[PDB]
Design a protein around this ligand. Sequence first.
Ligand SMILES: N[C@@H](Cc1cc(Cl)c([N+](=O)[O-])cc1CCC(=O)O)C(=O)O
Ligand SMILES: N[C@@H](Cc1cc(Cl)c([N+](=O)[O-])cc1CCC(=O)O)C(=O)O
Lengths: 258, 261
Amino acid sequence: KTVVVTTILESPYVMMKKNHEMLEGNERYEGYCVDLAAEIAKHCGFKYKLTIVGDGKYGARDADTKIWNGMVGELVYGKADIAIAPLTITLVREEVIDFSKPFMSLGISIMIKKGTPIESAEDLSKQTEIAYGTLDSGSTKEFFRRSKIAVFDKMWTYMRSAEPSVFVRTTAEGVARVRKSKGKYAYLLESTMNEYIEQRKPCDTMKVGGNLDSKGYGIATPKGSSLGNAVNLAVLKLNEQGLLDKLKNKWWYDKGEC
Amino acid sequence: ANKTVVVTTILESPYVMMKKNHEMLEGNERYEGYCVDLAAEIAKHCGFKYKLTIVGDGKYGARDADTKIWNGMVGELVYGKADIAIAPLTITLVREEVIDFSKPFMSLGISIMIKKGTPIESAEDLSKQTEIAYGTLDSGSTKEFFRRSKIAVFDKMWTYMRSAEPSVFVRTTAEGVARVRKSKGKYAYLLESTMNEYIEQRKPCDTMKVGGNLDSKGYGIATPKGSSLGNAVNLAVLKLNEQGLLDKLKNKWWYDKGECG
Ligand SMILES: N[C@@H](Cc1cc(Cl)c([N+](=O)[O-])cc1CCC(=O)O)C(=O)O
Ligand SMILES: N[C@@H](Cc1cc(Cl)c([N+](=O)[O-])cc1CCC(=O)O)C(=O)O
């Protein structure tokens, strides 16, 4: 019985191959999660089909309707058997689905265009000449909305009140905005993506400062899933054998363009 | 029928330490540290009463190959002697096979400790020379990491360490640190990054953590398989992290109390 894998088009985790049109099935896709899915299925002994999440979302529960969207939605409503993607392990998600132990550790970080005289969160919060912001929705924004730490609360108030808006619709828009803003915009995003973009042409961005927090991506399965236990052991084994580090290197650095 | 939760832990600075005045104290209050504070939080969120007990054999948890017996805190859980372990206990495959772990409350990796001034910047640097000796604890997970590693650099280091004379291994973490401090830049110590960072903030302020971490892993709260507490404990850990409490706790024990500026 073929396992339905839900995932999301997010570089360099899952991308359509340049020559995808001459390809079929799983082979249409490449990336860190594509490689990880193969390793997991190999170790747990299952065949699987990669499917792209229908609504292009990760997974948030609507406050009013209480409906779950994205890949979490596909798990809880029975459309997919497992999610393999840069999906953060969080309390609200863990209440309705299971996560493996983390396959990648990350935190919120700062992206600047090279030349921008900013070196940390503190620096940013102490000035306004260089605008800075986050995705207009989701986890990073929420970190600042809910934060009780002085400097981060400060940054948050600055962001809500800054004009024009410092928020962006998509991660790509955030990156593009840093790139086209001639050193006058800084983007706060997950460190994994920051580190990746830093190795891509035109090589005009960099990561500065330490991560503002600490979290991890996990493989997700429905509660009670007969795959959950084996998938978790697979992630730990892959980590312990150095495979996860090797996959990170392959996709961030070896295939790097800088 | 409800019973007090038996917590197994271990004396390891700054996770769990006996208070200077422990003699005039009783029970849990004899102890202080990061893991003491964390246990308080977990129990508070999960709503259980608990008793801190120190692991009888002073070990974290490994299965003897010959006897097949699990020692340490893992063993306590596996053999039914404790309800939960709260300590710098790494989540690993062989342990997950026999107990449950929460998601990590702390992230870490194997790292290099040097005496300040030592001309070494990475594992790669160490492996390519022998003038500056380097080693690990004479047992446990860091040594086992190098023994099992099929990564070229780490295997080469293992081969060097196993054959180096005099012995580059040490009996305790304290010994390794002391050896770094006394060896005039001629000994480098491989240990978990958490402890490395801690020691870096302690007088005489003569050590330094250098290079990237050699691996990536996490410490987790452990319960016996099928335990009733496992689920609630896991959600508690996630909440504490998201609420910023785990970072604040690490700051308290590592940096606020820091002795090196
Ligand atoms: N891990 C997030 C999804 C996500 C993934 C990536 Cl890889 C990036 N990113 O490219 O910086 C962002 C996000 C959303 C937060 C953000 O704005 O960083 C989740 O589980 O909700
Ligand atoms: N997390 C390890 C135990 C441990 C804890 C600490 Cl706090 C340090 N350390 O202070 O460097 C080391 C170890 C492992 C021995 C060693 O590497 O010396 C486990 O679960 O086996």
